[PDB]
Amino acid sequence: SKVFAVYGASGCGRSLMPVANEQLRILEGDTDSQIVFIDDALDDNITVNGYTAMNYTKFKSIKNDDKFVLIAIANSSIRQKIADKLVKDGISLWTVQGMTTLIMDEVSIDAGAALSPFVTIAANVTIGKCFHANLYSYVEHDCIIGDYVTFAPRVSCNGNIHIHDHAYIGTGAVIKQGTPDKPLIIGKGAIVGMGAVVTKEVPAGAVVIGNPARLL
Amino acid sequence: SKVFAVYGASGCGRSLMPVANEQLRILEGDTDSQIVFIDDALDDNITVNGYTAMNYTKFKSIKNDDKFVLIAIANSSIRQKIADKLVKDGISLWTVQGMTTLIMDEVSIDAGAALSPFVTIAANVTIGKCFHANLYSYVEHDCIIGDYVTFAPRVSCNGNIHIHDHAYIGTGAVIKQGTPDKPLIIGKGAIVGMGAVVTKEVPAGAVVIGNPARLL
Amino acid sequence: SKVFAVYGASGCGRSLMPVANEQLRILEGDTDSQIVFIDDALDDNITVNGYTAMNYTKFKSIKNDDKFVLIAIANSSIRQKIADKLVKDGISLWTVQGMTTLIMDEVSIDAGAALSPFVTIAANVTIGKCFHANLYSYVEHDCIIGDYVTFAPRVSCNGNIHIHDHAYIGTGAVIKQGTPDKPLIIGKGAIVGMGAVVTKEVPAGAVVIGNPARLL
Ligand SMILES: CC(C)(COP(=O)(O)OP(=O)(O)OC[C@H]1O[C@@H](n2cnc3c(N)ncnc32)[C@H](O)[C@@H]1OP(=O)(O)O)[C@@H](O)C(=O)NCCC(=O)NCCS
Ligand SMILES: CC(C)(COP(=O)(O)OP(=O)(O)OC[C@H]1O[C@@H](n2cnc3c(N)ncnc32)[C@H](O)[C@@H]1OP(=O)(O)O)[C@@H](O)C(=O)NCCC(=O)NCCS
Ligand SMILES: CC(C)(COP(=O)(O)OP(=O)(O)OC[C@H]1O[C@@H](n2cnc3c(N)ncnc32)[C@H](O)[C@@H]1OP(=O)(O)O)[C@@H](O)C(=O)NCCC(=O)NCCS
Ligand SMILES: CC(=O)N[C@H]1[C@@H](OP(=O)(O)OP(=O)(O)OC[C@H]2O[C@@H](n3ccc(=O)[nH]c3=O)[C@H](O)[C@@H]2O)O[C@H](C)[C@@H](N)[C@@H]1O
Ligand SMILES: CC(=O)N[C@H]1[C@@H](OP(=O)(O)OP(=O)(O)OC[C@H]2O[C@@H](n3ccc(=O)[nH]c3=O)[C@H](O)[C@@H]2O)O[C@H](C)[C@@H](N)[C@@H]1O
Ligand SMILES: CC(=O)N[C@H]1[C@@H](OP(=O)(O)OP(=O)(O)OC[C@H]2O[C@@H](n3ccc(=O)[nH]c3=O)[C@H](O)[C@@H]2O)O[C@H](C)[C@@H](N)[C@@H]1O
Ligand SMILES: [Cl-]
C-alpha cells in the first residue's frame, strides 16, 4: 500500500495536482492509492478542489510506511528545505509527469521533479534534484541542470546549456544553445526574467531581463 | 438529431474546423451529425476544405430544431453581434476543444469557447462568453476572463490575472502573474501586442507593445 | 523490406531519432524495419543512444533496394547537398512527424520534412523540400514555405506568410500574419533571430533581431 501527496496547495500545487493524478492513475496504473495535498498554512484539514488537504504534522501521522511526495512550491529555497525534511522523515520524493510530457533517449532526472504537460526533455539530458519544468518548457540535447532549478512556463532551454543550482528561468525566456566546447552557463541562483532573450553566460546571482538580456 | 457549424470560413474558421471535428467525432462520439461552415460572404453554397459552406440565411432555413454553432471570427465585436443573433434565433452556442486541450480542476467556461489544440486552462479558472484560446495559449490558476476575450496563439496568461471584456492578447505575449491580494488587470477592450511582456495593469482601451510593455 | 535512417547524429539528429521511431513504429505500424544513424564524422561504426551509427559509405553498401532517410542537420546548405546526393543514389527522402504533430486540412508537404512533437501545420499550407519544424513550431493558414526552410523551436509563423528558400527562423520568433492581398514575405536566405518580433517583410539575405525586429 502507498500514500501520495502534492506539497503546496496554492497555484503551483493546484496546477500540478491534475498532473500528479495522470502520473499516478495512468502512467503507474494505480487506481487504489490515495493522493492528498500537504500545506502548512492549514490547522484543521480542509478540501482543495475535492482533495483532502492537511498540514505536514497530520501527513506524518498517517500510518503508512510508503509515502511519496511531489513538492509543488516554486520557491527553490523552500523546496530544498522541504525535500531535506522529507528524506530525513523517511518519505520518498516522487517525480510526476503528464500524459503529454515527452522524455527522449538517455535522460537522467533525480527524484522529485515536477514535469508539467507539454514539456519536452530531449536527448542526453541530466537533471538534478526537485526540478520544476512548468507547462510547455523544454530542455534540449546535452543540457546539464543542477539541483532545485525552477522553470516558469514556456522556457526554451536550447542545447548544450548548463544551469547551476537554484537558478530561476521566467515565463517564455529563450536561451541560446551552447556548443560541445563551450556550454552556455546559467550561474548558481541566477534569475532570468520573463521574455528574456539570453545569448551569453549569466553570472551566478545575476538578474537579467529584456531582449537582448541585460543585468537589472 | 443535430446540425453543427463553424461560423467563419476564413483563417480563424479553417484552422478551427479540424478542432470542431475532434470535439464532435471524438469527445462527443458523434459520427452521425453533419457539420458545415457558415459565412455571410457566400451567396450560393460552396465547399471549403471538403465541407459545405453556406450563408446564415441558408443555415437558418435548415429544418432541424437542434443547431450548435462555434463562432470562429477573431474580431470580438463581430463575435458578440453573431452570438446575440444566434441566441435570439434559438441556435445554441457550442464550445469546441481539441484532443490535446487540457482542462484542469474547477474550471468554468461559458458556452461558445474556441479552445485550440495544445491549450491549457489551469485550476480554478472562470471564463465568460465566446472565449478564443488560440493554439498553445494557457490561462493559469485563479484567472477570471470576461466576455468576448480573444487570445492569439501562444499567449502566456499567468495566475491571478483578470482580463476584462473584449480584450485582445497578441501572439506570444507574456503577462506577469498577479497575487491573491492584487490580481493583475487587463482592462476592457485593451490590446496587448505580439511578443509584449506585460508586468503591470493595462488600462481599459490601452494598446501596449514591447519588452517591457509600453503604451503605443 | 526497408531500411530507415536519421542523417546526423549530433543534437538535431539525437532529438529527432525518437520522432523517427514514432513515425516508423506507430504511425507506419512498422516493428520490422531497422533504423540507424548516418554521420560522416564516423570511420568505424559506433552506437549512439542504442542505435547503430555509420558513415554514408557504409549506409550505401547495405544490400537493400528500399532506403528511407530523414536529414536531421539544421544547416540548410548541408541539408540540400545531402538531399541531392540521396536522390542521385536512389535513396528516398522520408518525412517524419511525432504522435503529437497536428496536420490540418489540405496541407501539402514535400518529402523529407522533420516535423517535431507539438508542431501544428494549419489549414491550406504548402511546404517545399526538407522542411525543419522544430519542437512547438506552427505554420498557420494559407502559408507557402519554400525549399530547405529551417525553424528553431517555438516559431510562431502566423497566417498568409510566404517564406522563401533557405530562410532560418530562430527560437521563439513571432511573425505577424499577412493578408490575402499582401502575404508577409520572408526573403530567400533571411535569418530571423531568437525572440524577434517581425511585423514587416524581411528582405532576401537580411538578418533581423529584436522587438521590434531590426536589421543586424
Ligand atoms: C524579472 C523579475 C524577477 C523582476 O521582479 P521584480 O524585481 O519584483 O520586478 P518589478 O515587478 O518590481 O519590476 C521592476 C522593473 O522592471 C520591469 N520588469 C519586471 N520584469 C520584467 C521583465 N521580465 N522584462 C522586462 N522588464 C521587466 C518592471 O516593469 C519594472 O519597471 P519600472 O521600474 O519601470 O516600473 C520578474 O518581473 C519576473 O520576470 N518574474 C517571472 C514571472 C513569471 O515568470 N511568472 C511565472 C509563474 S507561473
Ligand atoms: C500591436 C498591433 C495591434 C499594432 O497594430 P497596428 O496599429 O496595425 O500596427 P502597424 O502594423 O501599423 O505597426 C505600427 C508600428 O509599431 C510596430 N509594431 C507593430 N506591432 C508590434 C509589436 N507587436 N511589437 C512591436 N512593435 C510592433 C510596427 O513595426 C510599426 O513600426 P513603424 O511605425 O516604425 O513602421 C499589431 O502589430 C499586433 O501585434 N497584432 C497581433 C498580431 C497577431 O497576434 N496575430 C495572430 C493572429 S493568428
Ligand atoms: C541572431 C543570431 C543568428 C546572431 O548570430 P551571431 O551573428 O553569431 O551573433 P552573436 O552571438 O555574435 O551576437 C551578436 C550580438 O547580437 C546579440 N544577439 C545575438 N542574437 C540575438 C537575438 N536573437 N536577439 C537579440 N540580440 C541578439 C548578441 O548578444 C551580441 O551582442 P554584442 O555584440 O553586444 O555582444 C543568433 O544569435 C540567433 O538568434 N540564432 C538562433 C539560435 C537558436 O534559435 N537556437 C535554436 C537551435 S535548437
Ligand atoms: C504568488 C505567486 O507568485 N505564486 C506563484 C507560485 O505559486 P506557489 O504555489 O509556488 O507559491 P505561493 O502562492 O507563495 O504558495 C506557496 C504555498 O506553499 C505553502 N508552504 C510554504 C512553505 C512551507 O514550509 N510549507 C507550505 O506548505 C504555503 O502555505 C502556500 O500555500 O508559483 C507558481 C508556479 C505560479 N503559478 C504562482 O503564480
Ligand atoms: C486577415 C486576418 O488578420 N485574419 C486573421 C483572423 O481571421 P478571421 O477569420 O477571424 O478574420 P477574416 O480573415 O477577416 O475573416 C472573417 C470571416 O468572417 C466572415 N464574416 C464576418 C462577419 C459576419 O457578419 N459574417 C461572416 O460570415 C467573413 O465573411 C470572413 O470570411 O484571425 C485568425 C485567428 C488569424 N489566424 C487570421 O490571420
Ligand atoms: C552546435 C549547434 O548549434 N548545433 C545545433 C544544430 O545541430 P545539428 O546537429 O544540425 O548540427 P551540428 O552540431 O553542427 O552537427 C552536424 C552533424 O552533421 C554531420 N554531418 C555534416 C555534414 C555532412 O556532410 N555529413 C554529416 O554527417 C556532422 O558530422 C555532425 O555530427 O541544430 C539543432 C537543431 C540544435 N538543437 C543544435 O544545438
Ligand atoms: Cl508552446
Side-chain angles (χ1 to χ4, degrees):
Chain A
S1 76
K2 301 175 172 178
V3 180
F4 290 86
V6 172
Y7 204 141
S10 284
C12 180
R14 284 182 285 111
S15 294
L16 274 164
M17 179 58 90
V19 192
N21 274 270
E22 291 180 4
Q23 170 76 33
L24 183 61
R25 301 323 177 186
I26 307 175
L27 301 184
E28 296 186 27
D30 180 348
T31 49
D32 297 342
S33 298
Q34 294 303 125
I35 190 160
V36 302
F37 286 106
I38 306 159
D39 199 297
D40 297 316
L42 300 172
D43 189 355
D44 296 338
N45 292 7
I46 64 164
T47 65
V48 175
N49 293 166
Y51 296 89
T52 301
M54 68 192 67
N55 67 42
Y56 182 65
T57 302
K58 291 216 173 69
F59 183 79
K60 264 197 300 183
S61 79
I62 293 169
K63 291 182 278 167
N64 203 304
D65 285 350
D66 304 289
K67 294 175 183 178
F68 292 89
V69 175
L70 177 70
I71 307 163
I73 296 162
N75 181 299
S76 59
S77 180
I78 297 178
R79 189 155 79 248
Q80 175 164 28
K81 183 166 199 181
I82 294 174
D84 285 345
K85 176 176 71 186
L86 293 176
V87 171
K88 177 178 279 76
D89 291 339
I91 296 170
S92 296
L93 301 174
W94 181 41
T95 291
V96 158
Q97 75 196 59
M99 297 307 300
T100 59
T101 305
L102 177 58
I103 310 294
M104 296 196 177
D105 298 318
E106 298 193 7
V107 170
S108 182
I109 302 176
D110 290 354
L115 303 177
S116 285
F118 309 107
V119 163
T120 301
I121 310 296
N124 302 290
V125 168
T126 300
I127 301 175
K129 303 178 182 292
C130 298
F131 180 49
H132 275 200
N134 210 332
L135 292 160
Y136 308 97
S137 292
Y138 72 81
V139 178
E140 255 285 13
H141 60 92
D142 302 313
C143 286
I144 305 182
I145 306 313
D147 297 334
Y148 303 106
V149 173
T150 308
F151 287 9
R154 194 121 50 208
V155 169
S156 298
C157 182
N158 284 313
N160 289 293
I161 297 168
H162 292 183
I163 307 192
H164 295 176
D165 296 350
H166 284 284
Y168 177 88
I169 316 296
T171 302
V174 174
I175 312 170
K176 188 172 178 169
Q177 72 262 50
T179 64
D181 286 350
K182 193 169 164 59
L184 186 152
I185 297 170
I186 309 294
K188 183 175 168 172
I191 298 170
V192 174
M194 285 193 330
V197 178
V198 173
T199 60
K200 308 288 197 196
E201 175 166 340
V202 176
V207 184
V208 299
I209 65 160
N211 181 3
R214 60 177 205 285
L215 290 169
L216 159 139
Chain B
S1 76
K2 301 175 172 178
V3 180
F4 290 86
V6 172
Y7 204 141
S10 284
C12 180
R14 284 182 285 111
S15 294
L16 274 164
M17 179 58 90
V19 192
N21 274 270
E22 291 180 4
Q23 170 76 33
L24 183 61
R25 301 323 177 186
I26 307 175
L27 301 184
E28 296 186 27
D30 180 348
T31 49
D32 297 342
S33 298
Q34 294 303 125
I35 190 160
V36 302
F37 286 106
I38 306 159
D39 199 297
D40 297 316
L42 300 172
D43 189 355
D44 296 338
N45 292 7
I46 64 164
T47 65
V48 175
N49 293 166
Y51 296 89
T52 301
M54 68 192 67
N55 67 42
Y56 182 65
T57 302
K58 291 216 173 69
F59 183 79
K60 264 197 300 183
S61 79
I62 293 169
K63 291 182 278 167
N64 203 304
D65 285 350
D66 304 289
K67 294 175 183 178
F68 292 89
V69 175
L70 177 70
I71 307 163
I73 296 162
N75 181 299
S76 59
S77 180
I78 297 178
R79 189 155 79 248
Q80 175 164 28
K81 183 166 199 181
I82 294 174
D84 285 345
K85 176 176 71 186
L86 293 176
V87 171
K88 177 178 279 76
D89 291 339
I91 296 170
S92 296
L93 301 174
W94 181 41
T95 291
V96 158
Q97 75 196 59
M99 297 307 300
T100 59
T101 305
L102 177 58
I103 310 294
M104 296 196 177
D105 298 318
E106 298 193 7
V107 170
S108 182
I109 302 176
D110 290 354
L115 303 177
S116 285
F118 309 107
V119 163
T120 301
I121 310 296
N124 302 290
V125 168
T126 300
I127 301 175
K129 303 178 182 292
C130 298
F131 180 49
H132 275 200
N134 210 332
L135 292 160
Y136 308 97
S137 292
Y138 72 81
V139 178
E140 255 285 13
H141 60 92
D142 302 313
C143 286
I144 305 182
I145 306 313
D147 297 334
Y148 303 106
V149 173
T150 308
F151 287 9
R154 194 121 50 208
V155 169
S156 298
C157 182
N158 284 313
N160 289 293
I161 297 168
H162 292 183
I163 307 192
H164 295 176
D165 296 350
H166 284 284
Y168 177 88
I169 316 296
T171 302
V174 174
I175 312 170
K176 188 172 178 169
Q177 72 262 50
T179 64
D181 286 350
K182 193 169 164 59
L184 186 152
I185 297 170
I186 309 294
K188 183 175 168 172
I191 298 170
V192 174
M194 285 193 330
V197 178
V198 173
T199 60
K200 308 288 197 196
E201 175 166 340
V202 176
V207 184
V208 299
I209 65 160
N211 181 3
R214 60 177 205 285
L215 290 169
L216 159 139
Chain C
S1 76
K2 301 175 172 178
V3 180
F4 290 86
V6 172
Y7 204 141
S10 284
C12 180
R14 284 182 285 111
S15 294
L16 274 164
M17 179 58 90
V19 192
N21 274 270
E22 291 180 4
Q23 170 76 33
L24 183 61
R25 301 323 177 186
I26 307 175
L27 301 184
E28 296 186 27
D30 180 348
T31 49
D32 297 342
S33 298
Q34 294 303 125
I35 190 160
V36 302
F37 286 106
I38 306 159
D39 199 297
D40 297 316
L42 300 172
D43 189 355
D44 296 338
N45 292 7
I46 64 164
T47 65
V48 175
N49 293 166
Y51 296 89
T52 301
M54 68 192 67
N55 67 42
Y56 182 65
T57 302
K58 291 216 173 69
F59 183 79
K60 264 197 300 183
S61 79
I62 293 169
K63 291 182 278 167
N64 203 304
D65 285 350
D66 304 289
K67 294 175 183 178
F68 292 89
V69 175
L70 177 70
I71 307 163
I73 296 162
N75 181 299
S76 59
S77 180
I78 297 178
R79 189 155 79 248
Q80 175 164 28
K81 183 166 199 181
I82 294 174
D84 285 345
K85 176 176 71 186
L86 293 176
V87 171
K88 177 178 279 76
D89 291 339
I91 296 170
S92 296
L93 301 174
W94 181 41
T95 291
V96 158
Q97 75 196 59
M99 297 307 300
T100 59
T101 305
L102 177 58
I103 310 294
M104 296 196 177
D105 298 318
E106 298 193 7
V107 170
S108 182
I109 302 176
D110 290 354
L115 303 177
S116 285
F118 309 107
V119 163
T120 301
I121 310 296
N124 302 290
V125 168
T126 300
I127 301 175
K129 303 178 182 292
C130 298
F131 180 49
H132 275 200
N134 210 332
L135 292 160
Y136 308 97
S137 292
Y138 72 81
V139 178
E140 255 285 13
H141 60 92
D142 302 313
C143 286
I144 305 182
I145 306 313
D147 297 334
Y148 303 106
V149 173
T150 308
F151 287 9
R154 194 121 50 208
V155 169
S156 298
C157 182
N158 284 313
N160 289 293
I161 297 168
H162 292 183
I163 307 192
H164 295 176
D165 296 350
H166 284 284
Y168 177 88
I169 316 296
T171 302
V174 174
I175 312 170
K176 188 172 178 169
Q177 72 262 50
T179 64
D181 286 350
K182 193 169 164 59
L184 186 152
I185 297 170
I186 309 294
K188 183 175 168 172
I191 298 170
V192 174
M194 285 193 330
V197 178
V198 173
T199 60
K200 308 288 197 196
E201 175 166 340
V202 176
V207 184
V208 299
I209 65 160
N211 181 3
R214 60 177 205 285
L215 290 169
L216 159 139

